[PDB]
């Protein structure tokens, strides 16, 4: 019914914050991402995660990092959290020097690959675009891929928004909600609240009319087998 969240440690929360990109990529600097990196670090510290921030990593430094982390002994840890703050497209997030397949990163944490996390919740929080679609608004054995939750900031195929000053709509909401509810609600329920917050309260403002008055809806993908609570 509920994941055992009473191991000696809550676990690791790895935050990959990519702000500056190689000129060859044509990717604009991600202003506001620093507010996100900070808010996440304080939010998950209060939840008792051992937080590690990494800034501006190349596509190969992200993979080597995920690989070393998956080789860590996660025995005394209840869970694993990974937040990726960057530019992206459906199925890929950008390293500082180029695109990285999302399937390449998550695969190190598979049930059969990271044995000290088998049966434990593996959370991937992703702030990145998933395409260029615009929302205008209206009105015994266990599967190797079991126990994964992907909290995507947007719907498959759509743009994801960020405020150069306040940070991304999604990370702002995720953190607000967790500060308020992590001691009362089940994770999926907290996440549903994030969906309501970003969908109702945020609307893009832009001088470029094609990017003005746009809406966003995050997207929870759960392969979890039990309810998750950050309290005991």
């Amino acid at each position: 019914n509920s994941y055992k969240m009473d191991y000696p440690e809550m676990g690791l929360c790895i935050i990959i914050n990519n702000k500056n990109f190689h000129k060859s990529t044509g990717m604009t600097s991600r202003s506001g991402t620093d507010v996100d990196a900070a808010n996440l670090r304080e939010t998950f510290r209060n939840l008792k995660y051992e937080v590690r921030n990494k800034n501006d990593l190349t596509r190969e430094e992200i993979v080597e990092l995920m690989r070393d982390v998956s080789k860590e002994d996660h025995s005394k840890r209840s869970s694993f959290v990974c937040v990726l703050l960057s530019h992206g497209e459906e199925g890929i997030i950008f390293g500082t020097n180029g695109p990285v397949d999302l399937k390449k990163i998550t695969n190190f944490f598979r049930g059969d690959r990271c044995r000290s996390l088998t049966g434990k919740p593996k959370l991937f929080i992703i702030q990145a675009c998933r395409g260029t679609e615009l929302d205008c608004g209206i009105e015994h054995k266990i599967p190797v891929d079991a126990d994964f939750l992907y909290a995507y900031s947007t719907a498959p195929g759509y743009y994801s928004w960020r405020n150069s000053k306040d940070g991304s709509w999604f990370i702002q909401s995720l953190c607000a909600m967790l500060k308020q509810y992590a001691d009362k609600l089940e994770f999926m329920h907290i996440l549903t609240r994030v969906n309501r917050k970003v969908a109702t309260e945020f609307e893009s403002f832009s001088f470029d009319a094609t990017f003005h008055a746009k809406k966003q809806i995050p997207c929870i993908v759960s392969m979890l087998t039990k309810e998750l609570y950050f309290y005991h």
Partner: peptide, 4 residues
């Protein structure tokens, strides 16, 4: 607001 900018897009990621």
């Amino acid at each position: 607001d900018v897009a990621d």
